[PDB]
Subunit: 167 residues, 2 copies
Amino acid sequence: HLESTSLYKKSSSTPPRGVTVVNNFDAKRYLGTWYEIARFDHRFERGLEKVTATYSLRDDGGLNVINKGYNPDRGMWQQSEGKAYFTGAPTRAALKVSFFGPFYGGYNVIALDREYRHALVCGPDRDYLWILSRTPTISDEVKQEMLAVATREGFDVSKFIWVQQPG
Amino acid sequence: HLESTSLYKKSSSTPPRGVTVVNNFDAKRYLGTWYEIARFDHRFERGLEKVTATYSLRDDGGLNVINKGYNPDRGMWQQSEGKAYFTGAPTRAALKVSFFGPFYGGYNVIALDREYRHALVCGPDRDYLWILSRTPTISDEVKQEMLAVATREGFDVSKFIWVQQP
């Protein structure tokens, strides 16, 4: 049901001890819009609800990233744009991504279903984790499975904020 | 994010040393109803709850001002009707306001969000300050931004009364 992963380490881009990263990735199936179902309390997203990320293919072989979110303390929709590059082979879902302004960090897909409907992504350390989905909600069954992989890879899943989404 | 301002100083209308006043004001967007979220304990408003200020355009280029509130001591709603005129250009949010007789008070918009949803308004010295909003409550983030501008402009934010609103 899930894509194959293997242990993967790159200095400064992956968490200590490495993490299991997707190793037969097909970037074209990753394109388009994902809803952020859950995130750790990342400073660059603080406050945001109804968050999505939209990926598109660039001529230089990277991805454009469009981040959208609603700030309920301002009552406003916000958008920001970034870029993503593979750090090695494009079959390995390890990227560097601009998370705020010109600052890039590691972006590692550590679980992904074979139909590219749901993903667990971690940043360069264990303070950065996301659950992404093609739909604004996920099943309890998908939630359990994603939480289980995160726990196995050493993350503390009680740090998740469950992001408000439609439905 | 907030509208641009510039320093405006005029004795009797602004506080001493002047205050930063909005300088790209579009009065049509300021029209309609605002809730008074907070005020410094002004004697003409003492005890009032559920206070609103309503602005409408006059033919002569001023604003009609209606200040309304519930007075628990009287067990009655109360309102005062005044007129406000720009002291300078209509893009500068500094007005003079009269309700009784040939006497005028300064009204200076010193913070305003670009969507005209919240504003910080001062009078002729630092005993006169208001937070206005299009909604009867504001978020903590918006509250903190207004309190910071107030402090920047020399006001003592411990003087705010947080007005009773729905």
